[PDB]
Design an enzyme around this catalytic site. Structure first.
Site, PDB file in Angstrom:
ATOM      1  N   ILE A 141     -13.126  30.127   6.959  1.00  0.00           N
ATOM      2  CA  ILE A 141     -13.469  30.594   5.628  1.00  0.00           C
ATOM      3  C   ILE A 141     -14.263  31.884   5.749  1.00  0.00           C
ATOM      4  CG2 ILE A 141     -13.488  28.222   4.772  1.00  0.00           C
ATOM      5  CD1 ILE A 141     -16.369  28.111   4.682  1.00  0.00           C
ATOM      6  N   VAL A 156     -19.118  33.837   6.448  1.00  0.00           N
ATOM      7  CA  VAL A 156     -17.995  33.751   7.376  1.00  0.00           C
ATOM      8  C   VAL A 156     -18.291  32.654   8.398  1.00  0.00           C
ATOM      9  CG1 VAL A 156     -16.606  34.907   9.131  1.00  0.00           C
ATOM     10  CG2 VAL A 156     -17.304  36.141   7.060  1.00  0.00           C
ATOM     11  N   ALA A 157     -17.522  31.582   8.315  1.00  0.00           N
ATOM     12  CA  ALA A 157     -17.769  30.396   9.105  1.00  0.00           C
ATOM     13  C   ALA A 157     -16.456  29.709   9.488  1.00  0.00           C
ATOM     14  CB  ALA A 157     -18.679  29.439   8.333  1.00  0.00           C
ATOM     15  N   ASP A 193     -37.711  30.537   4.106  1.00  0.00           N
ATOM     16  CA  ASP A 193     -36.880  29.688   4.971  1.00  0.00           C
ATOM     17  C   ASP A 193     -35.917  28.783   4.170  1.00  0.00           C
ATOM     18  OD1 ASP A 193     -38.605  30.526   7.232  1.00  0.00           O
ATOM     19  OD2 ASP A 193     -40.018  29.005   6.439  1.00  0.00           O
ATOM     20  N   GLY A 225     -18.666  32.588   1.086  1.00  0.00           N
ATOM     21  CA  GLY A 225     -19.263  31.440   0.439  1.00  0.00           C
ATOM     22  C   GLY A 225     -20.715  31.310   0.831  1.00  0.00           C
TER      23      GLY A 225
END
EC number: 2.7.11.1
Length: 281
Positions: A18, A25-26, A131, A21
């Site tokens: 993918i 980019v993963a 964080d 999102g």
């Protein structure tokens, strides 16, 4: 940037690459042992592997609460360090709100309780503010969705507390309370507070309203006095006066229908892999 070829095809089944999102980019893959769907972020071996990445990874690996998007393992490739983490396959909380128009007071509380539990946990681990992506929490794949917070991941200005806009010094935990309030409001109202809905790109106006804590729950939105009160106690410009997480935990709106409940990878292995991933083929 482009992802390296598939690896570790003996523990992981590749689900999909993918390119955008919340997980950026993963790579979506499946653990063949657990049946679990996980996401993988990639960073080029070499200089990019720095003390921030070291610190984020270590800190991420330390967090074990069911409403935090959890770290699984770090993996070495000949070009990249692979960081495997839980994947929230339920989409964004915001999308669910939009689909529903707005949540009932009970559904909002159901998610808000999970939000506060997750935040309370992060705060006691000294994970505040920057964080946490509290402005874009996610849902898991469950039919009855569990809230999921990306911490250390690798919007609307409404999420920014007034002190964060004006003051040099501020407590990040207190700014987080404001942000939670915004999420509560949006769940109940179906739109952000402060932000003019017909002018959402008017940041000037939005900011002016944030600073003056100008919000108005629409007439057709009916909420209990308890709920209305909790909101007024979060939307306080002076951070010294803002309700705190512990005080929220004891608030009567929060306590209603509260569920009483609210073998990883070794540090040695992780540090050794982060170290080796500093050398860049």
């Amino acid at each position: 940037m482009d992802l390296p070829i598939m690896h570790d095809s003996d523990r992981y089944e590749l689900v999909k690459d993918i390119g955008s999102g919340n997980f950026g980019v993963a790579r979506l893959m499946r653990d063949k042992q657990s049946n679990e769907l996980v996401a993988v972020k990639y960073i080029e071996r070499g200089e990019k592997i720095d003390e921030n990445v070291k610190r984020e990874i270590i800190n991420h690996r330390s967090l074990r609460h069911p409403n935090i998007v959890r770290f699984k393992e770090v993996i070495l490739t000949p070009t990249h360090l692979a960081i495997v983490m839980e994947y929230a396959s339920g989409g964004e909380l915001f999308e669910r709100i939009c689909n529903a128009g707005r949540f009932s007071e009970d559904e909002a509380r159901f998610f808000f309780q999970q939000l506060i539990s997750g935040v309370s946990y992060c705060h006691a681990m000294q994970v505040c503010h920057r964080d946490l992506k509290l402005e874009n929490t996610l849902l898991d794949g469950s039919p009855a969705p569990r809230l999921k917070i990306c911490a250390f991941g690798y919007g609307t200005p409404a999420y920014i507390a007034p002190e964060v806009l004006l003051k040099k010094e501020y407590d990040g935990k207190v700014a987080d309370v404001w942000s939670c309030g915004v999420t509560l409001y949006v769940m109940l109202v179906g739109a952000y507070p402060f932000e003019d809905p017909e002018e959402p790109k008017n940041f000037r106006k939005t900011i002016h309203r944030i600073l003056n804590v100008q919000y108005a729950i629409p007439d057709y939105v009916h909420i209990s006095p308890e709920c209305r009160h909790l909101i007024s106690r979060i939307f306080v410009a002076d951070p010294a006066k803002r309700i705190s997480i512990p005080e929220i935990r004891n608030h009567e709106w929060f306590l209603k229908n509260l569920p009483a409940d609210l073998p990883g990878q070794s540090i040695e292995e992780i540090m050794q892999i982060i170290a080796e991933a500093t050398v860049p083929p």
